[PDB]
Amino acid sequence: VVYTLPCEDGNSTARTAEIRLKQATLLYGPSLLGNASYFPGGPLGDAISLRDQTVWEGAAVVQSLRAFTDAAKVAANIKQNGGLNSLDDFKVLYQDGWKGSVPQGIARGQSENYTSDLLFSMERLSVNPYILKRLHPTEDALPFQVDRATVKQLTKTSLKALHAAGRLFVADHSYQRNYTRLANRYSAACTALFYLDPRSNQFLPLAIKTNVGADLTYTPLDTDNNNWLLAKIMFNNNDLFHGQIFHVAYPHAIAEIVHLAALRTMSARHPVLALMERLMYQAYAVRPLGERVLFNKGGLFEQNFAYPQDMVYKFVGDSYPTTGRWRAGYLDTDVRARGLVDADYGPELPHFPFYEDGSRLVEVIRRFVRSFVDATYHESDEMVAKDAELQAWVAEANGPAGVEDFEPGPLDTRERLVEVLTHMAWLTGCAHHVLNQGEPVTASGVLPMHPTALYAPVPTSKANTTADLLGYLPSAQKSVDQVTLLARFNRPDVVPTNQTLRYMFAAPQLLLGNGEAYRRANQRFVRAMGRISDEVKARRFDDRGLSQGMPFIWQALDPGNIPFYLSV
Ligand SMILES: *[C@@H]1O[C@H](CO)[C@@H](O[C@@H]2O[C@H](CO)[C@@H](O)[C@H](O)[C@H]2NC(C)=O)[C@H](O)[C@H]1NC(C)=O
Ligand SMILES: *[C@@H]1O[C@H](CO)[C@@H](O)[C@H](O)[C@H]1NC(C)=O
């Protein structure tokens, strides 16, 4: 199969007949996991979904067996240590364990530095960077009030001064206030307030408000009863839920619907669709299995989290009108819109690890996609504009497929197609793995500070509550169940099978079906991603014990370790 644009194909009546058959058999079926994007239906849509699920099953079985072996080992070791009767006992949950299912190990520094405020705040700029926003001096009010004396001891200034200087930031999970909780499961609905401290030039936590029950406000000065430490725990619990259900819409639902629109309008012979098919490897396995293995009643999610299934579906439906917007989710557009990059109303964040690694990856991807588009369309914008199948795709996405905020048609320049395909590659090869893939087990779901559920009521009092936080955290057993669940979202075999971001474009069918310019661009991409992978693998702590300004080694965007596709 040598790929052809429609005008290059002398076999074109049969080509178009094939596309009309796809259009009769590959339909827009109901959205899965809530009110997001359509899912493939009809006989062909069912067969595509089934094909993907069937391929996915093999690595899922192998990996689950690995995770259960590792789990039995770790549980033996927690038994020899006499259980989990302290916070610092939780290290036994990870020490020398999970070598089979999580061979990259837990992110260094997570367990060792788990009380660090700077770690807690910098996680909002790394492990889940999709909630934080800067507070505009005049267009945003303060999310809540904080004791003036407390603020001044903490900051040597005031909230009005920091707010006016554009140095305040907020991560707001208060939408969880009135969620249903499962019996004997609890959670708050925290709003966390952060600031960029002019003294240390560090992005630091300032206050956490639960927004539930007694609706109390916490601060690093609340050292009594381990209150502040617990508040962070509560926030992380909310935040983990956010990051995992956020990623249902972004990347999964968006990529799925954009690609479904392409499958209905472009030939299998089309170079662009073949590229997209590579990026979307196994993608349509995720939401069906989510319905029946993960989010079912009930159900591994329900067995480890604090909310029932209909709250997951509620969150998806509530967030998709925003998080499903295609152009709004381009890397730069999103971080600028939230005021974290190029903000005119506040100082630049000194360290933003997600944006640093992410923007570099986007540039490497874009160099490849620019060469791909140039070779395919012979350096001609008119050839893009005259590609009837490409234009059919864009109109299908903007119309019957219901893609939100897609690129408006017609799409008449190479540059715009480059933006679209670069963003697809970003979604399947990078963003997915910032939020999901190995990120939870290695960082954002690391116990004790990131439990998937709480096990005692959120305190109604600062003074009259227990100083022992073990009642809220999962037990010795439920910790092993949590780490097992999150370990089953890792896929180590992408490394030995070269199914990683580094080899995203090195597909045999793409190398054979495109010309020599394709191969040369692939070679450049593979080399660049290999160098970035070498750098990420080599990250170490500096003299102050800080990697990328953080008390932990963040390797979630190592191109040599993460899939090129939406693997789980
Ligand atoms: C976070 O925990 C890590 C453990 O990996 C600490 O790492 C050490 O950091 C010092 C510098 O402070 C280095 O000289 C050591 O070589 C590091 N050890 C290892 C095994 O990497 C790190 O200091 C901690 N960071 C903070 C801020 O507490
Ligand atoms: C024309 O396209 C159809 C559909 O793929 C195929 O069966 C036929 O062999 C093609 N003809 C040539 C000469 O490639």
Ligand SMILES: *[C@@H]1O[C@H](CO)[C@@H](O)[C@H](O)[C@H]1NC(C)=O
């Ligand atoms: C993986 O890719 C490298 C090229 O960088 C190659 O040397 C190796 O043989 C490949 N392994 C497999 C299984 O594809």
Ligand SMILES: [Mn+2]
């Ligand atoms: Mn996923």
